[PDB]
């Protein structure tokens, strides 16, 4: 499990700025903090972790002072259109934490040990702003506390409280379709797998015994309801589709895989999704 706190800060000019942030536990969002909002919003019943009301409000105040401060401080460092991204959290195992900062889409600074360092290949004009920043011994101390202690202690509480929503199972639903391959007299078969949780999945094209080596695993694309979509494609020579199947393995299924053969169930499904092919591609 990787726990992330992600901050996004836009500085258009001296008088225009906003910072919205989000928080992930695995592939599930736990927190939202909109620039419109003074308070951090829970996005789950268990987003308070195992902290008490006041214990949470103590931590929230800490962050409230930070956001105002960050905003004013950055605009000063500028003097020595700006996008800044912060990635802070820890990875659970014992644990290991991190604080990475990115400037104009490029990773440039991390908090490491007791102070801010520039990462190799960082632009040298950062040296002054960093020298100024490292002087603030109060910030150094509260950061070390968050990274070394609060984060691990918090996350071990989030996992225990979120046990249920983390272990949940949602079954995949597959369907077939195909398009012209860029190669003459070829077609690309497409196996659509959608609505599964957790993320890990096995999707292959088969000729019964053999896994089709031409099978191309696509990227994981998300669904709005926190489930996943993935498609495996296969480039066949037109006429060779018959005898092929899409096989889907997933933890929600028992041992009972989804096999979809190209050709009755497939016939009715294709008859349900006919169109005029505009504007196809």
């Amino acid at each position, epitope marked *: 499990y990787t726990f992330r706190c992600l901050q996004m800060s836009s500085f258009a000019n001296r008088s225009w700025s906003r910072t919205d942030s989000v928080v992930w536990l695995g592939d599930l969002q736990t927190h939202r903090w909109s620039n419109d909002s003074a308070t951090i919003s829970f996005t789950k019943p268990w987003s308070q972790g195992k902290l008490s009301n006041q214990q949470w409000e103590k931590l929230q105040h800490m962050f409230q002072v930070y956001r105002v*401060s960050f905003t004013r401080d950055i605009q*000063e460092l500028v003097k*020595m259109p700006i996008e800044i991204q912060l990635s802070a959290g820890c990875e659970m195992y014992a644990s290991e934490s991190f604080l990475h900062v990115a400037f104009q889409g490029k990773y440039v600074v991390r908090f490491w040990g007791t102070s801010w360092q520039t990462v190799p290949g960082a632009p040298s004009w950062l040296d*002054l702003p960093i020298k*100024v*920043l490292n*002087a*603030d011994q109060g910030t150094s101390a509260t950061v070390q506390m968050l990274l070394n202690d609060t984060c691990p202690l918090f996350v071990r509480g989030l996992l225990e409280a979120g046990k249920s929503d983390l272990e949940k199972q949602e079954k995949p639903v597959a369907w077939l379709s195909s398009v012209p391959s860029s190669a003459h007299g070829h077609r690309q078969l497409v196996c659509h797998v959608s609505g599964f949780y957790p993320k890990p999945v096995w999707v292959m094209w088969m000729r019964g015994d053999q896994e089709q080596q031409g099978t191309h695993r696509g990227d994981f694309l998300p669904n709005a309801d926190e489930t996943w979509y993935l498609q495996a494609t296969l480039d066949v020579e037109a006429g060779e589709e018959a005898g092929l199947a899409c096989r889907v393995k997933h933890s929600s299924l028992g041992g009972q895989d989804i096999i979809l053969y190209w050709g009755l169930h497939h016939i009715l499904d294709a008859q349900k999704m006919v169109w005029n092919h505009r504007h196809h591609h």
Partner: T-cell receptor
Framework: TQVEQSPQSLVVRQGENSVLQCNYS??????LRWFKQDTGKGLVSLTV?????DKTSNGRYSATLDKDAKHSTLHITATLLDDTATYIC?????????????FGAGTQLIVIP | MKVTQMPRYLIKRMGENVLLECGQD?????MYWYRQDPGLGLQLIYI???????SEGDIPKGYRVSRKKREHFSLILDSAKTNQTSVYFC???????????FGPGTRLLVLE
């Protein structure tokens, strides 16, 4: 105005002790500095207070800080005649140069022989 | 050591260039320009974090500033106004939480 000093002026007999108060609204509140300004002169730092409950000393000068009450006291023990000055309380909202420094109006301490 | 500030007294006519100089030998990075007015208190005009790296204080209007060397910090008034009559103080410090050192001041009077 986020820093208030109390009282405005203080008359003490040479050799006695005097007590100066500072209250503030500054947030965040990183540090509190006490300054001494003689007539026609620049400010000279007496002491710097950093902790939540802090106590400092500089010879005859000593100060306390309660960040909860957001309140500081400057104590002058056995006041000399050269202690006749304006005493300035300053709160910083940062632990570095990036910080905004809020300057009080100051207490005038007049020591009489 | 101390903080240098010259001249001590200055009388200028309305709409004249005013250069107020300042110096320190502690090789401090941070330097400040203030003005002190009856009862009102110290108001920051300009700060400097190092060479060629300045930032407007609380009341920058009518004032510009220069710092081409670490040891000096010049306050420039391009055309002086009668409300720019005040006592001007220089100051320096380390980039951290160390002592702040002030100069002796400059009494500037601007007249019609």
């Amino acid at each position: 105005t986020q820093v208030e000093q109390s009282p405005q002026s203080l008359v003490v007999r040479q050799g006695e002790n005097s007590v100066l108060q500072c209250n503030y609204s500054v947030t965040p509140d990183n540090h509190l500095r006490w300054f001494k300004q003689d007539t026609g002169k620049g400010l000279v730092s007496l002491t710097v207070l950093v902790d939540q409950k802090d106590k400092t000393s500089n010879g005859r000068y000593s100060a306390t800080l309660d960040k909860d009450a957001k309140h500081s006291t400057l104590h002058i023990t056995a006041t000399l005649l050269d202690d006749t000055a304006t005493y300035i309380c300053v709160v910083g909202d940062r632990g570095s140069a990036l910080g905004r420094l809020h300057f009080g109006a100051g207490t005038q301490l007049i020591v009489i022989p | 050591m101390k903080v240098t500030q010259m001249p001590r007294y200055l009388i200028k006519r309305m709409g004249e260039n005013v250069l107020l100089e300042c110096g320190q030998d502690m090789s401090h990075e941070t330097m400040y320009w203030y003005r002190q007015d009856p009862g009102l208190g110290l108001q920051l005009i300009y700060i400097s974090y190092d060479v060629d790296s300045n930032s407007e204080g609380d009341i920058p209007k009518g004032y510009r500033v220069s710092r081409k060397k670490r040891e000096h910090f010049s306050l420039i008034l391009d055309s002086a106004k009668t409300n720019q009559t005040s006592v001007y103080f220089c100051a320096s410090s380390s980039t951290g939480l160390d002592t702040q050192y002030f100069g002796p001041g400059t009494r500037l009077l601007v007249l019609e």
